[PDB]
């Protein structure tokens with residue numbers, strides 16, 4: 001997803017002037033048409049987050065006895081000590097992406113934006129709820145394999161599920177049971193390398209930081225266009241109204257309206273084109289949730305570079321991380 | 329067959345009962361109509377001209393004054409088409425994505441059977457039937473869903489005679505007292521045999537192996553032939 | 566070797582009657598004629 | 609007696625999967641289900 005934004009087209013163009021708002025009405029439905037478009041984008045951000053994460057109608061939970069045959073999920077499972085049930089690896093991701101304007105009660109760049117009629121809406125699903133869906137998808141995987149995708153969750157021992165996986169890549173199930181202590185140590189060490197990687201580099205989450213950056217840059221560009229004259233004797237609407245009487249003021253105010261309105265039509269066009277990219281990425285992420293988490297994929301390189309065994313979802317700010325487990 | 333026939337019955341009942349089932353198609357028809365109406369409504373707007381009606385401007389003003397008013401209607405009107413065509417190009421890209429998805433579901437769910445989990449409905453995919461709809465396609469996805477589960481005790485291997493046995497296909501289960509192989513996706517227990525299983529290594533390396541007998545279907549043939557063999561000797565004494 | 570068995574013939578709509586070969590059987594019988602030749606000589 | 613309520617949404621039904629290192633669940637029966645899916649073309 002990306003940040004839900006809405007704009008008061010009248011407060012942006014004419015901020016608190018009646019005599020500007022009567023000129024803005026001469027442009028017809030354009031302000032309503034912009035508001036609609038931004039609402040259509042904003043609803044799609046919940047549609048996307050729901051299609052990616054809400055792929056289970058039951059919230060499964062891991063048993064208190066962690067006997068997964070030597071495989072150690074404690075760095076991808078929940079942590080009850082944290083004031084949200086986020087896992088160890090997820091709470092790294094929430095530090096790596098440096099968010100901006102989550103719209104959680106205003107009472108700075110964010111304050112400048114909001115004070116010009118650019119409001120940011122909450123997502124429908126808070127970061128606790130995405131963590132719970134992600135916990136349920138993971139608990140279904142490590143206790144029930146693919147079957148909670150197809151129907152009822154059916155328990156299976158984790159080493160026997162890994163054997164069914166191995167059979168899915170044309171490696172006979174005795175190759176698991178004859179190497180299980182090694183296969184578990186390799187899996188545990190590879191999960192260790194994920195925590196080290198995320199602690200070490202900043203660029204690993206670049207695909208999510210670029211989305212947050214483009215939302216912030218597009219909001220800032222729309223605020224900066226309030227500084228522009230567009231050929232009027234001042235860029236400040238109150239100065240035009242202070243210095244000129246009505247028939248001269250209308251000629252200057254119409255230049256500010258015309259330029260501002262083109263600035264919103266540009267912003268909403270850029271945001272509709274970004275919404276289609278994020279929309280695609282969310283349909284891909286929902287497909288990887290269904291085919292790599294709820295299943296095992298024969299699709300080469302769809303679920304990581306290797307023969308696919310299983311994948312674990314992790315939530316991230318505006319995104320999803322998949323930890324793809326592959327036999328190489 | 330009765331389950332399939334009853335499930336097709338429930339589709340007719342559903343479509344007769346609710347209006348919201350086709351919302352994904354009605355929203356497209358609604359957005360086309362709303363975008364056309366918004367483009368017609370922008371003919372009402374002055375854009376700062378002394379009237380929104382082109383003939384009035386031309387009736388009331390002579391050429392050099394009329395050109396200044398008509399240019400405001402042209403400028404505003406143009407921007408209204410450039411907006412409509414931009415919205416329609418962005419909708420055309422969404423509908424085209426959806427059409428590439430529908431073409432992929434036609435090829436992989438109708439012309440085939442898909443191993444892709446949840447691509448052809450919530451279940452294990454058997455087959456899908458296409459149906460036409462106004463501006464769309466409906467797929468009736470037919471799926472096997474496993475329904476009445478029982479718990480069993482299980483093992484990764486059976487240890488019989490110093491050697492570890494694994495299922496060729498399926499899984500080992502016990503009801504508590506006896507052990508069987510069953511196929512993974514439907515309970516159909518069969519006696520553990522050298523036909524149902526294959527061998528690899530001794531019993532020491534597999535964590536959680538269990539001791540049980542492993543039947544050999546050559547052996548009672550060889551022994552029923554050994555009692556025929558004994559009867560030939562005993563008579564020929 | 567080419568087939569597997571499940572249930573009696575009564576439940577499958579459209580089942581047909583045909584012979585089902587057992588490749589152990591002519592081995593066991595060619596061994597029964599070797600077995601008979603050992604007895605018949607040893608008379 | 610009807611009115612508008614407001615609530616924190618539930619994400620689903622609560623469900624502990626009965627996992628154990630030697631327990632398996634196997635379906636004794638199946639439902640064939642037919643589910644519609646609708647796409648703009």
Ligand SMILES: *[C@@H]1O[C@H](CO)[C@@H](O[C@@H]2O[C@H](CO)[C@@H](O[C@H]3O[C@H](CO)[C@@H](O)[C@H](O)[C@@H]3O)[C@H](O)[C@H]2NC(C)=O)[C@H](O)[C@H]1NC(C)=O
Nearest residue numbers: 066067068070071072073074075076088188189191192195
């Ligand atoms: C599953 O993997 C977990 C992550 O490696 C592991 O937790 C780790 O356990 C060790 C052993 O106790 C900890 O090592 C530290 O233990 C105490 C801490 O006060 C010190 O005396 C030691 O010198 C050492 O620093 C790791 O810190 C700990 N890591 C985390 C993130 O908790 C689990 O034990 C593993 N579970 C199983 C069943 O193997």
Ligand SMILES: *[C@@H]1O[C@H](CO)[C@@H](O[C@@H]2O[C@H](CO)[C@@H](O[C@H]3O[C@H](CO)[C@@H](O)[C@H](O)[C@@H]3O)[C@H](O)[C@H]2NC(C)=O)[C@H](O)[C@H]1NC(C)=O
Nearest residue numbers: 480481501502503504505506507508516517518519520541
């Ligand atoms: C686990 O599954 C086993 C196989 O279905 C089952 O054992 C079988 O139980 C039946 C009785 O329900 C036995 O039937 C025989 O019972 C007496 C024997 O003298 C006769 O009156 C009957 O005609 C018939 O021969 C089966 O012989 C027996 N099979 C075996 C291999 O022993 C268990 O009862 C099941 N256990 C649980 C806990 O459910």
Ligand SMILES: *[C@@H]1O[C@H](CO)[C@@H](O[C@@H]2O[C@H](CO)[C@@H](O[C@H]3O[C@H](CO)[C@@H](O)[C@H](O)[C@@H]3O)[C@H](O)[C@H]2NC(C)=O)[C@H](O)[C@H]1NC(C)=O
Nearest residue numbers: 486487488489490491530531532535536537538539540541
């Ligand atoms: C599965 O079946 C195995 C074969 O019956 C069985 O192994 C046997 O285990 C017993 C008990 O450990 C051994 O008994 C001998 O053990 C030592 C000498 O090795 C002596 O101190 C004892 O007095 C006694 O003589 C058997 O020798 C051993 N046989 C083999 C071939 O390993 C497993 O224990 C069984 N496991 C389960 C879970 O049923």
Ligand SMILES: *[C@@H]1O[C@H](CO)[C@@H](O[C@@H]2O[C@H](CO)[C@@H](O[C@H]3O[C@H](CO)[C@@H](O)[C@H](O)[C@@H]3O)[C@H](O)[C@H]2NC(C)=O)[C@H](O)[C@H]1NC(C)=O
Nearest residue numbers: 571572573574575576577578579580581582583584585586
């Ligand atoms: C497939 O092969 C089956 C075995 O040969 C055969 O079943 C046999 O069918 C006949 C005719 O129905 C039965 O004949 C007897 O039927 C009743 C008594 O049950 C009497 O009124 C008759 O006089 C006669 O004695 C056989 O008893 C029956 N055998 C068995 C084991 O069921 C099928 O009919 C064959 N089907 C096809 C399509 O070829």
Ligand SMILES: *[C@@H]1O[C@H](CO)[C@@H](O[C@@H]2O[C@H](CO)[C@@H](O[C@H]3O[C@H](CO)[C@@H](O)[C@H](O)[C@@H]3O)[C@H](O)[C@H]2NC(C)=O)[C@H](O)[C@H]1NC(C)=O
Nearest residue numbers: 329330331332333334335475476477635636637638639640
């Ligand atoms: C597998 O699940 C099937 C349902 O999807 C189930 O079919 C149902 O079987 C019961 C009988 O066991 C029928 O119940 C009715 O039975 C008679 C009338 O036929 C009455 O005495 C009863 O009061 C009751 O009305 C169901 O109607 C029937 N449903 C269908 C769609 O056939 C199978 O029996 C299950 N099979 C196994 C092996 O578990």
Ligand SMILES: *[C@@H]1O[C@H](CO[C@@H]2O[C@@H](C)[C@@H](O)[C@@H](O)[C@@H]2O)[C@@H](O[C@@H]2O[C@H](CO)[C@@H](O)[C@H](O)[C@H]2NC(C)=O)[C@H](O)[C@H]1NC(C)=O
Nearest residue numbers: 063155476477478479480624625626627628631632633634
């Ligand atoms: C599969 O079994 C679990 C519980 O394990 C069983 O516990 C004993 C009572 C006995 O039955 C043993 O053979 C097993 O080891 C079932 O989970 C329980 O479900 C009931 C509701 O039906 C609930 O009240 C309990 O609290 C549950 N217990 C746990 C630990 O989850 C499970 O329902 C069984 N599967 C089926 C299909 O019935």
Ligand SMILES: *[C@@H]1O[C@H](CO)[C@@H](O)[C@H](O)[C@H]1NC(C)=O
Nearest residue numbers: 065067069535536537629630
């Ligand atoms: C299964 O867990 C029990 C403890 O609940 C333990 O005694 C047993 O050795 C374990 N078996 C396997 C095969 O892991």
Ligand SMILES: *[C@@H]1O[C@H](CO)[C@@H](O)[C@H](O)[C@H]1NC(C)=O
Nearest residue numbers: 559560561562563564565608
């Ligand atoms: C016993 O042996 C004789 C030949 O010595 C043979 O004719 C007879 O059929 C045999 N009977 C049996 C029951 O084997």
Ligand SMILES: *[C@@H]1O[C@H](CO)[C@@H](O)[C@H](O)[C@H]1NC(C)=O
Nearest residue numbers: 575576577578579580581582
């Ligand atoms: C096949 O159809 C014929 C009628 O054309 C009918 O007599 C026969 O019983 C049917 N067989 C099966 C197995 O359905």
Ligand SMILES: *[C@@H]1O[C@H](CO)[C@@H](O)[C@H](O)[C@H]1NC(C)=O
Nearest residue numbers: 599602603604605606607608
């Ligand atoms: C017949 O039996 C004798 C031993 O009594 C043996 O030497 C001979 O090779 C046998 N021949 C055949 C054809 O079995």
